[PDB]
Scaffold this active site. Structure first.
Site, mmCIF file in Angstrom:
data_model
loop_
_atom_site.group_PDB
_atom_site.id
_atom_site.type_symbol
_atom_site.label_atom_id
_atom_site.label_comp_id
_atom_site.label_asym_id
_atom_site.label_seq_id
_atom_site.Cartn_x
_atom_site.Cartn_y
_atom_site.Cartn_z
ATOM 1 N N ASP A 154 42.452 46.716 41.009
ATOM 2 C CA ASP A 154 42.126 45.417 40.370
ATOM 3 C C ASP A 154 41.050 45.631 39.311
ATOM 4 O O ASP A 154 40.045 44.939 39.362
ATOM 5 C CB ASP A 154 41.682 44.381 41.400
ATOM 6 C CG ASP A 154 41.595 42.983 40.831
ATOM 7 O OD1 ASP A 154 41.988 42.808 39.683
ATOM 8 O OD2 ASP A 154 41.137 42.093 41.549
ATOM 9 N N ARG A 158 35.976 40.786 35.575
ATOM 10 C CA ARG A 158 35.551 39.960 36.736
ATOM 11 C C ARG A 158 34.977 40.821 37.874
ATOM 12 O O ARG A 158 34.052 40.347 38.566
ATOM 13 C CB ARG A 158 36.702 39.074 37.193
ATOM 14 C CG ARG A 158 37.938 39.798 37.668
ATOM 15 C CD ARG A 158 38.973 38.804 38.178
ATOM 16 N NE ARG A 158 40.141 39.569 38.596
ATOM 17 C CZ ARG A 158 41.114 39.976 37.790
ATOM 18 N NH1 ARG A 158 41.120 39.645 36.513
ATOM 19 N NH2 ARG A 158 42.098 40.712 38.260
ATOM 20 N N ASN A 159 35.449 42.054 38.011
ATOM 21 C CA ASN A 159 35.016 43.018 39.056
ATOM 22 C C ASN A 159 34.008 44.026 38.471
ATOM 23 O O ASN A 159 33.804 45.115 39.071
ATOM 24 C CB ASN A 159 36.251 43.665 39.695
ATOM 25 C CG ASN A 159 37.158 42.620 40.325
ATOM 26 O OD1 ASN A 159 36.669 41.598 40.800
ATOM 27 N ND2 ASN A 159 38.467 42.844 40.344
ATOM 28 N N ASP A 172 33.072 45.358 42.203
ATOM 29 C CA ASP A 172 33.943 44.935 43.321
ATOM 30 C C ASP A 172 35.179 45.822 43.378
ATOM 31 O O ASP A 172 35.490 46.450 42.381
ATOM 32 C CB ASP A 172 34.338 43.470 43.208
ATOM 33 C CG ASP A 172 34.581 42.868 44.572
ATOM 34 O OD1 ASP A 172 33.873 43.254 45.503
ATOM 35 O OD2 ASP A 172 35.487 42.040 44.688
#
Ligand SMILES: C[C@H]1CNC(=O)c2cnn3ccc(nc23)N[C@H](C)c2cc(F)ccc2O1
Length: 297
Positions: A154, A158-159, A172
């Site tokens: 992923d 955002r991570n 993340d």
């Protein structure tokens, strides 16, 4: 028995200050940790709570803690250890003052609805040489992880997290925070993938490899040069699948020099084997970061 010694933390040295955010059925707090490490007697941290404590989720946790403990690098958010003394189970990372890279991008947008300061960065659009600096640091993380034939399924702004002075790290991995996030496509129940970031071999044959990552990283560059736009924002989850699978490519961003678009296009080779090594992608971005090419309108 046999495993990695994970640094455990007393609940008394952890003072929760407030919610930073809430995702992956695990709230995230700002907190103060007393005597975590001798350099600072009281010091700020981010803390990941767990909403459930079921024995098949306490397992998730021990693996994550172990894996997190080994994955130590310049551009991966420092992990300080866990805390299982009480309940909710806690995870403790360095505090990244600018929060997730995607928000941070959108807030240094031209499209930005209000101005966001900070003492370590100008408000308003970021310097191409900074944009590249960001990219460069994500690529430095990706290289490490490829080093250990680890596959982040992923990869996305955002991570990632942004700290003092515009340090950028990977923050993340598993357990997607926002369950109503529009970047993820619900395929079964309790099974969601960030389609828009995914290469054809992954939408089609459901295969994920360091090459899949390289592909995903090209989209991260695209996100980075659009000040956090959602790839294929005009399209639907199925429309994006069609696009990727048909072979449609993301347009060049206005802010994006053709030397970088070039890098992006080498991440998006339909043949996985024909995609540039991450190491080479990192190198060229680091080089470009060192001497940002000129580019207008
Ligand atoms: C609640 C959000 C924002 N986190 C922090 O601002 C935030 C600030 N420092 N820090 C450290 C870890 C951490 N968040 C933060 N972990 C969480 C799970 C995380 C990781 C990401 F890559 C992106 C977002 C994110 O959580």
């Amino acid at each position: 028995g046999s495993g990695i010694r994970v640094h455990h933390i007393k609940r008394r040295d952890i003072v929760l200050k407030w919610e930073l955010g809430e995702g992956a059925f695990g709230k995230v707090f700002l907190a103060e940790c007393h005597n975590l490490l001798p350099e600072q007697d009281k010091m700020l941290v981010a803390v990941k709570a767990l909403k459930e404590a079921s024995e098949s989720a306490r397992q998730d946790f021990q693996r994550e803690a172990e894996l997190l403990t080994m994955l130590q690098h310049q551009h991966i958010v420092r992990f300080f250890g866990v805390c299982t003394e009480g309940r909710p189970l806690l995870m403790v990372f360095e505090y990244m003052r600018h929060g997730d890279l995607n928000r941070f991008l959108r807030s240094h947008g031209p499209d930005a609805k209000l101005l966001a300061g900070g003492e370590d960065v100008a408000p308003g659009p970021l310097g191409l040489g900074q944009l590249l600096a960001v990219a460069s640091q994500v690529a430095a993380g990706m290289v490490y992880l490829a080093g250990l034939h680890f596959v982040h399924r992923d990869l996305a702004t955002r991570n990632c997290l942004v700290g003092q002075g515009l340090v950028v790290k990977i923050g993340d991995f598993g357990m997607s925070r926002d369950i109503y996030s529009t970047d993820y496509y619900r395929v079964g129940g309790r099974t969601m993938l960030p389609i828009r970031w995914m290469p054809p071999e992954s939408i089609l044959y459901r295969k994920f490899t360091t090459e899949s990552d390289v592909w995903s990283f090209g989209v991260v560059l695209w996100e980075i040069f659009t000040y956090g736009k959602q790839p294929w924002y005009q399209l639907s989850n199925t429309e994006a699948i069609d696009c990727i699978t048909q072979g449609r490519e993301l347009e060049r961003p206005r802010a994006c020099p053709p030397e970088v678009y070039a890098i992006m296009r080498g991440c998006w080779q339909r043949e996985p084997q024909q995609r540039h090594s991450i190491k080479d992608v990192h190198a060229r971005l680091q080089a470009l970061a060192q001497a940002p090419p000129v580019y207008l309108d």
